[PDB]
Amino acid sequence: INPSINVRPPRGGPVDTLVGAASDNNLVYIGDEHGKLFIPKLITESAAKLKNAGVDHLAVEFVKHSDGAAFREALSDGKSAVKHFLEASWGRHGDAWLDKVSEALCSAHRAGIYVSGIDRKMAIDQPKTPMQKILYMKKRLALNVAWDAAATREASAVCANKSIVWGGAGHFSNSKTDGPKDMRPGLVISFDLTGRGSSRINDADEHSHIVIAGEDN
Numbered sequence: 584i585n586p587s588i589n590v591r592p593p594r595g596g597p598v599d600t601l602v603g604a605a606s607d608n609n610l611v612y613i614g615d616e617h618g619k620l621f622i623p624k625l626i627t628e629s630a631a632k633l634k635n636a637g638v639d640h641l642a643v644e645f646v647k648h649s650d651g652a653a654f655r656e657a658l659s660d661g662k663s664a665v666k667h668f669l670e671a672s673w674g675r676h677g678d679a680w681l682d683k684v685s686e687a688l689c690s691a692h693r694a695g696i697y698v699s700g701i702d703r704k705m706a707i708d709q710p711k712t713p714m715q716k717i718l719y720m721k722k723r724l725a726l727n728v729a730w731d732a733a734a735t736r737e738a739s740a741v742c743a744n745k746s747i748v749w750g751g752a753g754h755f756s757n758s759k760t761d762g763p764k765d766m767r768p769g770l771v772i773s774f775d776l777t778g779r780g781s782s783r784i785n786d787a788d789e790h791s792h793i794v795i796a797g798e799d800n
Protein backbone atom coordinates (compact mmCIF):
# COMPACT_ATOMS: atom_id res chain seq x y z
CA ILE A 584 0.00 0.00 0.00
CA ASN A 585 1.04 3.61 -0.59
CA PRO A 586 3.67 4.45 2.09
CA SER A 587 1.80 7.72 2.76
CA ILE A 588 -1.11 5.62 4.06
CA ASN A 589 0.06 4.64 7.56
CA VAL A 590 -2.16 1.86 8.93
CA ARG A 591 -1.73 1.59 12.72
CA PRO A 592 -3.69 -1.13 14.57
CA PRO A 593 -6.69 0.63 16.16
CA ARG A 594 -5.92 2.14 19.57
CA GLY A 595 -8.84 0.69 21.50
CA GLY A 596 -11.91 2.91 21.68
CA PRO A 597 -13.78 4.43 18.73
CA VAL A 598 -12.60 7.98 19.45
CA ASP A 599 -9.04 6.82 20.15
CA THR A 600 -8.97 4.91 16.85
CA LEU A 601 -10.25 7.80 14.72
CA VAL A 602 -7.89 10.35 16.28
CA GLY A 603 -4.97 7.94 15.99
CA ALA A 604 -5.73 7.39 12.30
CA ALA A 605 -5.77 11.14 11.69
CA SER A 606 -2.59 11.52 13.76
CA ASP A 607 -0.80 9.03 11.49
CA ASN A 608 -2.04 10.34 8.11
CA ASN A 609 -2.34 13.65 6.30
CA LEU A 610 -5.62 12.47 4.73
CA VAL A 611 -8.34 10.25 6.18
CA TYR A 612 -11.58 9.18 4.49
CA ILE A 613 -14.62 8.45 6.67
CA GLY A 614 -16.95 6.16 4.75
CA ASP A 615 -20.44 7.28 5.69
CA GLU A 616 -23.41 4.97 6.04
CA HIS A 617 -26.24 7.43 5.53
CA GLY A 618 -28.75 7.33 8.38
CA LYS A 619 -26.53 5.64 10.99
CA LEU A 620 -26.31 7.78 14.13
CA PHE A 621 -23.04 6.28 15.39
CA ILE A 622 -20.86 7.90 12.71
CA PRO A 623 -21.85 11.58 13.13
CA LYS A 624 -21.87 11.10 16.92
CA LEU A 625 -18.31 9.77 16.70
CA ILE A 626 -17.18 12.85 14.77
CA THR A 627 -18.85 15.17 17.29
CA GLU A 628 -16.99 13.51 20.16
CA SER A 629 -13.68 13.52 18.25
CA ALA A 630 -13.78 17.11 16.97
CA ALA A 631 -11.59 18.85 19.55
CA LYS A 632 -9.13 15.95 19.73
CA LEU A 633 -8.95 15.76 15.93
CA LYS A 634 -8.11 19.48 15.79
CA ASN A 635 -5.33 18.94 18.34
CA ALA A 636 -4.03 16.01 16.27
CA GLY A 637 -3.54 18.42 13.34
CA VAL A 638 -6.89 18.13 11.52
CA ASP A 639 -7.65 21.62 10.20
CA HIS A 640 -10.13 20.73 7.44
CA LEU A 641 -13.27 18.59 7.19
CA ALA A 642 -14.68 18.20 3.67
CA VAL A 643 -18.15 16.66 3.56
CA GLU A 644 -20.47 15.25 0.90
CA PHE A 645 -23.49 16.76 2.63
CA VAL A 646 -22.74 20.25 1.23
CA LYS A 647 -22.26 21.12 -2.42
CA HIS A 648 -18.99 22.92 -3.03
CA SER A 649 -20.91 25.57 -4.96
CA ASP A 650 -23.01 26.40 -1.86
CA GLY A 651 -19.97 27.24 0.28
CA ALA A 652 -21.02 30.80 1.09
CA ALA A 653 -24.57 29.94 2.14
CA PHE A 654 -23.35 27.01 4.24
CA ARG A 655 -20.77 29.09 6.13
CA GLU A 656 -23.60 31.43 7.15
CA ALA A 657 -25.66 28.52 8.48
CA LEU A 658 -22.63 27.11 10.29
CA SER A 659 -22.44 30.34 12.30
CA ASP A 660 -26.18 30.56 12.99
CA GLY A 661 -25.92 27.18 14.72
CA LYS A 662 -27.06 23.58 14.63
CA SER A 663 -30.66 24.53 13.86
CA ALA A 664 -29.62 26.54 10.80
CA VAL A 665 -27.38 23.78 9.42
CA LYS A 666 -30.17 21.21 9.66
CA HIS A 667 -32.60 23.38 7.69
CA PHE A 668 -29.89 23.99 5.07
CA LEU A 669 -29.17 20.25 4.66
CA GLU A 670 -32.78 19.06 4.80
CA ALA A 671 -33.65 19.63 1.13
CA SER A 672 -30.96 17.21 -0.06
CA TRP A 673 -30.27 15.07 3.02
CA GLY A 674 -33.37 15.00 5.24
CA ARG A 675 -34.48 11.87 3.38
CA HIS A 676 -32.09 9.84 5.57
CA GLY A 677 -33.77 10.63 8.89
CA ASP A 678 -34.52 13.58 11.14
CA ALA A 679 -32.42 12.29 14.04
CA TRP A 680 -29.50 11.50 11.74
CA LEU A 681 -29.72 14.90 10.04
CA ASP A 682 -29.71 16.46 13.51
CA LYS A 683 -26.59 14.49 14.48
CA VAL A 684 -24.90 15.34 11.17
CA SER A 685 -25.61 19.02 11.82
CA GLU A 686 -24.24 18.74 15.37
CA ALA A 687 -21.07 17.12 14.00
CA LEU A 688 -20.48 19.88 11.44
CA CYS A 689 -21.08 22.54 14.09
CA SER A 690 -18.85 20.76 16.63
CA ALA A 691 -16.06 20.61 14.04
CA HIS A 692 -16.53 24.28 13.13
CA ARG A 693 -16.44 25.56 16.71
CA ALA A 694 -13.41 23.34 17.38
CA GLY A 695 -11.44 25.41 14.85
CA ILE A 696 -11.86 23.05 11.87
CA TYR A 697 -12.79 24.53 8.50
CA VAL A 698 -15.88 22.68 7.22
CA SER A 699 -16.50 22.78 3.47
CA GLY A 700 -18.54 20.95 0.85
CA ILE A 701 -17.34 18.56 -1.84
CA ASP A 702 -20.53 17.56 -3.61
CA ARG A 703 -21.65 18.48 -7.11
CA LYS A 704 -25.15 18.45 -8.56
CA MET A 705 -26.11 15.33 -10.50
CA ALA A 706 -29.66 14.13 -11.12
CA ILE A 707 -30.27 10.40 -11.58
CA ASP A 708 -33.55 8.52 -11.33
CA GLN A 709 -34.25 5.97 -8.62
CA PRO A 710 -32.78 2.59 -9.66
CA LYS A 711 -35.27 -0.29 -9.82
CA THR A 712 -33.87 -2.92 -12.19
CA PRO A 713 -30.62 -4.78 -11.47
CA MET A 714 -28.76 -2.89 -14.20
CA GLN A 715 -30.11 0.50 -13.10
CA LYS A 716 -28.81 -0.15 -9.58
CA ILE A 717 -25.38 -0.88 -11.06
CA LEU A 718 -25.34 2.06 -13.48
CA TYR A 719 -26.55 4.40 -10.72
CA MET A 720 -23.58 3.59 -8.48
CA LYS A 721 -21.12 3.77 -11.38
CA LYS A 722 -22.51 7.19 -12.30
CA ARG A 723 -22.29 8.37 -8.68
CA LEU A 724 -18.65 7.26 -8.49
CA ALA A 725 -17.86 9.43 -11.51
CA LEU A 726 -18.07 12.38 -9.09
CA ASN A 727 -15.02 11.23 -7.10
CA VAL A 728 -12.72 13.32 -9.30
CA ALA A 729 -14.79 16.42 -8.51
CA TRP A 730 -15.18 15.63 -4.82
CA ASP A 731 -11.39 15.38 -4.68
CA ALA A 732 -10.85 18.67 -6.53
CA ALA A 733 -13.16 20.51 -4.12
CA ALA A 734 -11.61 18.93 -1.02
CA THR A 735 -8.13 19.80 -2.29
CA ARG A 736 -9.04 23.40 -3.14
CA GLU A 737 -10.51 24.10 0.30
CA ALA A 738 -7.74 22.35 2.24
CA SER A 739 -5.18 24.53 0.45
CA ALA A 740 -7.30 27.67 0.90
CA VAL A 741 -6.70 27.44 4.67
CA CYS A 742 -3.23 25.82 4.56
CA ALA A 743 -4.52 22.70 6.28
CA ASN A 744 -2.01 20.38 7.91
CA LYS A 745 -4.36 17.38 7.81
CA SER A 746 -7.81 16.93 6.28
CA ILE A 747 -10.69 14.47 6.60
CA VAL A 748 -13.06 13.71 3.73
CA TRP A 749 -16.47 12.46 4.90
CA GLY A 750 -18.74 10.92 2.28
CA GLY A 751 -20.65 7.83 1.25
CA ALA A 752 -18.60 4.69 1.79
CA GLY A 753 -19.54 3.40 -1.67
CA HIS A 754 -17.25 6.07 -3.11
CA PHE A 755 -14.23 4.64 -1.24
CA SER A 756 -14.35 1.01 -2.39
CA ASN A 757 -11.24 -0.75 -3.71
CA SER A 758 -9.16 1.81 -1.82
CA LYS A 759 -6.64 -0.42 -0.02
CA THR A 760 -3.69 0.02 -2.37
CA ASP A 761 -3.97 3.71 -3.30
CA GLY A 762 -7.08 5.12 -1.60
CA PRO A 763 -10.36 5.90 -3.36
CA LYS A 764 -10.42 5.83 -7.14
CA ASP A 765 -9.83 9.23 -8.78
CA MET A 766 -8.99 10.71 -5.36
CA ARG A 767 -5.80 11.40 -3.43
CA PRO A 768 -4.27 8.53 -1.42
CA GLY A 769 -5.47 8.42 2.16
CA LEU A 770 -6.43 6.21 5.07
CA VAL A 771 -10.00 4.96 4.53
CA ILE A 772 -12.18 4.08 7.52
CA SER A 773 -15.22 1.80 7.40
CA PHE A 774 -17.71 0.86 10.11
CA ASP A 775 -18.87 -2.48 11.50
CA LEU A 776 -22.20 -1.73 13.19
CA THR A 777 -23.01 -5.38 13.99
CA GLY A 778 -21.89 -5.03 17.61
CA ARG A 779 -19.98 -8.31 17.20
CA GLY A 780 -16.46 -7.40 16.14
CA SER A 781 -14.00 -4.85 17.45
CA SER A 782 -12.12 -2.07 15.71
CA ARG A 783 -9.57 -3.71 13.45
CA ILE A 784 -7.54 -3.60 10.27
CA ASN A 785 -9.68 -4.64 7.32
CA ASP A 786 -8.74 -8.03 5.87
CA ALA A 787 -12.10 -9.16 4.43
CA ASP A 788 -11.82 -6.88 1.38
CA GLU A 789 -9.96 -3.87 -0.02
CA HIS A 790 -12.74 -1.30 0.46
CA SER A 791 -11.10 0.25 3.55
CA HIS A 792 -7.93 0.07 5.62
CA ILE A 793 -9.40 -0.06 9.15
CA VAL A 794 -12.86 -0.91 10.47
CA ILE A 795 -14.25 0.92 13.50
CA ALA A 796 -16.68 -1.15 15.56
CA GLY A 797 -19.89 0.73 16.31
CA GLU A 798 -23.56 0.43 17.25
CA ASP A 799 -26.51 0.20 14.91
CA ASN A 800 -29.47 2.53 15.42
Ligand SMILES: [Cl-]
Pocket residue numbers: 647648649703
Ligand atom coordinates in the same frame (compact mmCIF):
# COMPACT_ATOMS: atom_id res chain seq x y z
CL1 LIG B 1 -18.48 23.40 -7.51
Ligand SMILES: [Cl-]
Pocket residue numbers: 661662663689
Ligand atom coordinates in the same frame (compact mmCIF):
# COMPACT_ATOMS: atom_id res chain seq x y z
CL1 LIG C 1 -26.32 24.53 18.66
Ligand SMILES: [Cl-]
Pocket residue numbers: 715718
Ligand atom coordinates in the same frame (compact mmCIF):
# COMPACT_ATOMS: atom_id res chain seq x y z
CL1 LIG D 1 -31.37 3.88 -16.95
Ligand SMILES: [Cl-]
Pocket residue numbers: 723751753
Ligand atom coordinates in the same frame (compact mmCIF):
# COMPACT_ATOMS: atom_id res chain seq x y z
CL1 LIG E 1 -23.83 7.26 -3.44
Ligand SMILES: [K+]
Pocket residue numbers: 761762763764765766767768
Ligand atom coordinates in the same frame (compact mmCIF):
# COMPACT_ATOMS: atom_id res chain seq x y z
K1 LIG F 1 -6.30 6.96 -5.51
